[PDB]
Amino acid sequence: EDWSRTGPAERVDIAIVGLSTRFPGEMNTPEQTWQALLEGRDGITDLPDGRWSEFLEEPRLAARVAGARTRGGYLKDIKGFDSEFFAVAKTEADNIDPQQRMALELTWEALEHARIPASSLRGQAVGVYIGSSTNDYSFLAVSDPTVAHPYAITGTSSSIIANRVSYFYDFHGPSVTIDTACSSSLVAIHQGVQALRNGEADVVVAGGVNALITPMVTLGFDEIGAVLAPDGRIKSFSADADGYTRSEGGGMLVLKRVDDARRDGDAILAVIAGSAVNHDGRSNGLIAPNQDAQADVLRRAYKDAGIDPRTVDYIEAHGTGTILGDPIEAEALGRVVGRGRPADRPALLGAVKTNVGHLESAAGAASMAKVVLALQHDKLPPSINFAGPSPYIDFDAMRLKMITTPTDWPRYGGYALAGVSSFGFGGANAHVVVREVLPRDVVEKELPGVTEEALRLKEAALEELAAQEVTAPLVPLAVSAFLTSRKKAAAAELADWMQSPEGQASSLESIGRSLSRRNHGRSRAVVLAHDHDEAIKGLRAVAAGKQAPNVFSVDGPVTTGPVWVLAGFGAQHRKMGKSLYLRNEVFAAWIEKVDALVQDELGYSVLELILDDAQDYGIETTQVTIFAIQIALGELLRHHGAKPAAVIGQSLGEAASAYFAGGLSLRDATRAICSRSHLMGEGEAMLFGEYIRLMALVEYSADEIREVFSDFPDLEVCVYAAPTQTVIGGPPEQVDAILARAEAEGKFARKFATKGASHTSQMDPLLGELTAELQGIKPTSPTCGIFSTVHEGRYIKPGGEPIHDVEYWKKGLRHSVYFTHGIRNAVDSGHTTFLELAPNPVALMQVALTTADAGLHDAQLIPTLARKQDEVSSMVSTMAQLYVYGHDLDIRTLFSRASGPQDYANIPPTRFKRKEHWLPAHF
Amino acid sequence: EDWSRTGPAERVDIAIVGLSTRFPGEMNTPEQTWQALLEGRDGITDLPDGRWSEFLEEPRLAARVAGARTRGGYLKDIKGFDSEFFAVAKTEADNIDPQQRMALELTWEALEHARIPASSLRGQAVGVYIGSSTNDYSFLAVSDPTVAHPYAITGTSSSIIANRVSYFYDFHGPSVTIDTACSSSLVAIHQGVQALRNGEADVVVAGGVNALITPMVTLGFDEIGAVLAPDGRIKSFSADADGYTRSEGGGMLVLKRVDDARRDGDAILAVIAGSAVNHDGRSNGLIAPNQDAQADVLRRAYKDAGIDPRTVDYIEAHGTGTILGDPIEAEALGRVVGRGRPADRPALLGAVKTNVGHLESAAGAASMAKVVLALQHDKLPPSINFAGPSPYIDFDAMRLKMITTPTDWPRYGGYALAGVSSFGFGGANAHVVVREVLPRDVVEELPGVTEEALRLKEAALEELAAQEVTAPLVPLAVSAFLTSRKKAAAAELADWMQSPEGQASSLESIGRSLSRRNHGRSRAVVLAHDHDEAIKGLRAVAAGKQAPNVFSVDGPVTTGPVWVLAGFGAQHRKMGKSLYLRNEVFAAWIEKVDALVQDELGYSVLELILDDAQDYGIETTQVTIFAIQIALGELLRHHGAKPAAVIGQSLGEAASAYFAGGLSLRDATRAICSRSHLMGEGEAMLFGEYIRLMALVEYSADEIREVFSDFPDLEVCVYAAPTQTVIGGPPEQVDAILARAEAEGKFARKFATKGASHTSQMDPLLGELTAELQGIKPTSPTCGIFSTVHEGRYIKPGGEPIHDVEYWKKGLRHSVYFTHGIRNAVDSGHTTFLELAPNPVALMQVALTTADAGLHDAQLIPTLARKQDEVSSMVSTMAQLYVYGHDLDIRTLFSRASGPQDYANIPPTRFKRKEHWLPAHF
């Protein structure tokens, strides 16, 4: 229990990993926005259709709509919401919005652009600092003074804009709304940066929105004087300037600490070095700018960033196109930035306001987007509407050079640098210093190991592998949604895109990666493919509804976790786990660790037998090798994020089971399995003749056995495999007599010709030596609920008490195995998914029979590696199935870490079914 | 310039130095609030006479309003604003959102409660984080969308609530309005704390405000249908809980870094240690409280503070009074705060909502008052409306215990701790932990007096202690932004001082209280010894009648002062000795220059000052007057005075060199002794054929240039006035002009001086003056010099070195141009002259010259006099400097206050308000 104060908040650079735009004419993606900037577009139009259609009544308001300057930037389709995506009823979805629609959708788009799964942030400390300015839908919220509506407080409140975002996405972090007029987005970004720096949140969504709903604000802005341009365009720092115009839109940015963005392997677009914010006092008039105030903002921001303001290559300015504000801004800029510039290194001016207009509270977002895009495409957009340098600004006296044609970056200090300024009409100034990505923030600051023979055989095997065919790897394409119809439609779209030339030119692995870095919704589907044609066929199957040999698609998560069936009675095949050792590294490391342990215990190395294909097997070597492969498989699964919920183990697959439950540790499990195997080795080497036993898989139940031992009292029960079948072992004579009886009673019988007939009577001498060996292990509290087949199948609850002592390993070896009772108890406790970790799946048939008798016929049997199969593909299929059914699996960990934008694909984005959700408001 | 990545932020504790209040019931200072809390008053009332009165016109909404849950903590006087005080016009003032008016007034009240004058914060890094969750005045103001007024965007907006506060008070710091529903205040405070910890502000005014203007929001909040209590009394953590009611009223807090509060001298009311804020996430919807989030805020807050939550005493909580939310808050509290309590330790619980209601965005402002006020009076207030423990929450199970009667402070683990929690209805949660003030956070070669000086000082202190004490003169400083307001404030203060509480208060305490208030444009000062003199002076100020010790002014004097460093024959037997015995800065500087003069010639001037038997020769008088001038000016500059222009005379040039930045100290000492020893040696060796006897005559420059061929060896010594002139020459030609002017009608007052300077007689002496002024460095002056050496022409500030060896060579020979320099000062606006000598002799000449040049309202301030107590004289000069509007820090006139007994509850500032409201046609 530590309570000793947090610690200092170190000043660090803040990476930017995502970005999304809904600008009033620069279009709705950060690739359309870049095209519009690079070409140079104008988003100013007249009132589309009827947008004030509501206030267009009261026929005198109509006159002043056609009397006030009503041009500006508008956004098509303000009314639109996929209410079933965002889980809002029809009666509620119209009382919300429209700024909260834009916020909710822009958060999704920014998270998709950053390529972080939106489902990986639910239940995490993610701050949401959103800046809004006006509440004008609330007017529509109350239009009939004969009724009143609920849902109105949370529907059109201003705080609730930044709360709903935290609600829907389940963000447990500081969620506030900001209001500082025309600078809300920049101060919101500044506060997000501060929150990230003092460790309140790990990822922050920042930005701002703005919507134009009523003409009342425009009418009020009209009656101030000459503040609104008759033309409807904005020419910043030009000879001509007669006012700005008001636009609607919004922007969002996903901020992350630079170390966090390097560790998580994301692509950094640009870093923020520092920022500042202040007020301007007087400022003779509430809406009059100041020079010393803005110079103070610049100085504080650039001292926070730790850079020299005279090495800045570009300055995105406020530039609201005023004959009085612009000279003041230019002089303030030149007093700090253009102070000692040697007349040949001028700072480039340029304002995004000439393309989009004045975006109010979202203005600081829009500029930011530009400065980010120009810092990733390595260009500089030109500023439109510029006629000629203004009389009241002496450009060459300062270091200002208003660009007109797309230039390249003038790196006056080596790396690209920029500054974004924004000044509100209340007097709140903000300035953000945006750098470019740099090399400095992508680079970081005993046991008997393998023997000498192992090296030789490994060297031979690697060349033999490198002297074979060029096999096509198996790639999982993962499609997902929150419903089933959405998943089908998305699969159809992805299949269609995969056939066009862009889809055909894209590598399969890149498409798989881009799919694996998306949202993992409730409904999931996976298509395992080798080339494009197989992928298209499987995606068509998913979209239609049919099944396929290697295509999985379920409707909802399985409620209960898996049960790891640690099997391995008769699972050996001569090439046990050799391919995976060469072609997978975690498997090889865990195998070598187990080899070191086994070498310490017994003397020989499992790795030699595994790699070599000359020596065959035997009960000792078979058991130890199967245990080693089981451990390696379990750790490979748990390296990708798999977690057992219960564990059941049969015979030799018991010790490994212990390690997977927290009932022992790897060394103790190795102890137990090696001692056991050595005991059977020597015992079966000795006991023959008057001591020979046998085994038989007879079709007798637990009760049909209770009336069949009377004739042959000396037989015993080895394993209760299924509630139809059972392994019997006893004297040879009585064994063939029972086979003859089974033949004449309609009962299948088959002899297992294995010397090591354990669990019956041959181990009576051996257990004493066992007592000499295993004494000294330390059982601990089980972190996983074990279905003890040795204790007749009681669901020993996690965390209770150590249950793995020397008697348990003695009794389990001596007495019978209660597999079917344990499985029956498991299916009656909720579990439906069983995962068998064995070289060759043989126990899934027994599990299928037991679960079929127990009532549940639609189970989920998931096998590991098998014979005459590609082991890498088997592992991929097992992990894909785990992903589909809903269990713990990080799909992003399959595909390797990328290098650049060429390792991903331009897969189609998600779609929303937007319906007109508007309120009938008569004024 | 250096740009090297401003260092990190260090997690320090934030002191609260001020506080305001406009809660229901306690509509005033935080001393009525304490009475109402300790009394258990209920501020929840019904609908006032007319509250809405706008939408209560249509006979449809009227019935629904009449059948709604419309009881709550309604405030009186929402429509009253003091327009003239806040400089806004009329048509602008009816628009301004009442939330903005409330914030404007509460900021002033907080700055008064903290005892930090508002005018002292002009144009500095002052952050303004204000929380506000609604603007329903936009409905009324932007109603009638036909002919609506221009001012609705600037006026009734939300980003402007904090921006007007930053504007009016001229705060250059981060100003922002915050919106997180019912947690806004507790969030804003939190953000302010972070600012003070990363260096983006120095004093932060953080708080919240809320107002009920429209019933539509109330009727809507009634919906759902089961969250508004029938009666209205919020019963929190009780068996009965039928909802909550709305309220209005806000609150501010003046936050400072604890180091700043310690260093300045303010009284630390309480200390915030940590704060945290997060969101619920998804639990059961927006308006469904989640418990794991409400435990996480507590854990993060108490790890940010570094405080173990199992030692907190008071858990002032949300207490919304809902039948479901309160148990959830209880489990949240018991999981973190009361987890491991050794079973006595009943984690005393309380809520302020039961006295004032639910204040929405200002809720975190209400609780932060209750916890602070209690922390200032060392006693928990009772919490009303607690019938019995609720069935669903087991109080004794976790650690909980409701408080019902005024209870003393448990002090588990040492000091007093607390915790304020707010949980918004949108999902935002905030928790702030407050400590108690602690013993920490409040605490942490040139010879001097020689042996002979020590002995004489001991004798002088014996003599000083022999005589009894006399009442010290105390300046009472009244100020306002208008003449009428200052008059009214003076009248009210006099009425207060006639009252018994105003009769049992020490005058020093009243002065101290008045010195830490806003110093406006109109100013007035009354210097008094006892209460009746003060009362009569205050009545004179209110009436407008003049008085000896009363000073008053209608507006600031534009140009800066002029330090007339002069004096010829102003010496007497005991100058500069009484204030040396009753002031330590003056004494320190006297000894500082005494070391230098000991270095220069052979001896200490302080010995001459102490001993009263010394016969003041020319050399000794010159150096003593130089030392007195230096100490006087540096004492004046220690209190914040700053000369705008200096002008010397004779031996006044040497000190003007130091006070203009043209020279360092040792340079001025070298100059003054180089002059003095030479004159001292030279004067004795002069006789009948050699003495150039100086005498004053009453002939101006033209009237001496006319009659100058009559008198050959006579010469100008000092141009003193546009009519007078000091002349020097051989005695017979002196007497001849004296006698002729006697008949002509002129005045020939003769000087009995013997070391006659400003003559051709000094030519022999200049040879050693040349060699005794070497090694000094003239330096660029920091302010203008009206040098009398160079004819009197002005010299601009920050130019080139002037006081070189040749400059002093000219100064010791050629005539003094005092009168022309004074007239040149007249030319460029200057009106105030302050004369630094132990006797105001040059003031007469300056007065005559200013009368010549057309100034009849010329402010001429003498510093010291003879046969006048020197400390009283200095207090008078410094009060006059304050009065006229120059740069004097009046708060430094008094001593550091050791407790609340050192201040006086003087009447507060008054706001004369008028009704500003819009038409109600909605």
Side-chain angles (χ1 to χ4, degrees), chain A residues 457-458 460-468 470-536 538-543:
Chain A
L457 308 116
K458 183 180 174 181
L462 219 37
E463 318 203 321
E464 296 264 17
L465 177 69
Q468 285 160 357
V470 194
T471 67
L474 188 57
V475 155
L477 302 181
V479 181
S480 170
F482 75 105
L483 279 169
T484 309
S485 311
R486 305 276 190 170
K487 182 192 57 194
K488 294 174 178 178
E493 297 195 27
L494 169 69
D496 296 355
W497 172 87
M498 258 188 137
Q499 224 162 4
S500 87
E502 190 192 14
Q504 290 280 346
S506 314
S507 175
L508 204 70
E509 186 179 5
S510 76
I511 309 171
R513 203 179 273 102
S514 300
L515 282 163
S516 87
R517 282 185 161 268
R518 291 214 159 185
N519 175 249
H520 314 316
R522 265 194 55 266
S523 183
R524 304 182 177 190
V526 167
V527 179
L528 300 96
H530 286 269
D531 49 76
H532 282 60
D533 319 323
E534 304 184 10
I536 301 166
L539 284 165
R540 287 308 191 187
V542 164

Side-chain angles (χ1 to χ4, degrees), chain A residues 7 13 158 168 170 282 304, chain B residues 5 11 145 168 170 179 282:
Chain A
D13 314 326
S158 78
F168 182 75
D170 197 31
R282 267 175 293 200
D304 202 338
Chain B
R5 180 63 107 170
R11 289 208 144 81
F168 181 71
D170 214 43
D179 221 339
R282 178 140 48 171

Side-chain angles (χ1 to χ4, degrees), chain B residues 357-386:
Chain B
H358 178 64
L359 277 161
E360 308 173 25
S361 43
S367 312
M368 262 297 188
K370 177 157 186 164
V371 195
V372 158
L373 288 180
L375 267 157
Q376 203 198 6
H377 305 126
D378 219 355
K379 208 164 192 173
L380 285 59
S383 189
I384 75 181
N385 290 332
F386 180 69

Side-chain angles (χ1 to χ4, degrees), chain B residues 202-249:
Chain B
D202 303 343
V203 161
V204 169
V205 171
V209 66
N210 174 32
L212 319 169
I213 297 96
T214 63
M216 306 131 55
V217 197
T218 293
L219 299 203
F221 222 105
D222 161 46
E223 281 316 280
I224 322 164
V227 284
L228 293 204
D231 40 19
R233 322 162 290 211
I234 310 193
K235 307 115 183 159
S236 48
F237 293 93
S238 100
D240 192 9
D242 41 9
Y244 54 78
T245 179
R246 306 160 72 64
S247 319
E248 48 182 8

Side-chain angles (χ1 to χ4, degrees), chain B residues 284-308:
Chain B
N284 207 30
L286 303 197
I287 308 204
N290 175 15
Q291 146 202 159
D292 273 349
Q294 293 179 353
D296 207 27
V297 280
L298 266 63
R299 231 176 308 271
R300 308 181 111 207
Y302 290 105
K303 200 146 313 183
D304 184 41
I307 295 304
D308 189 325

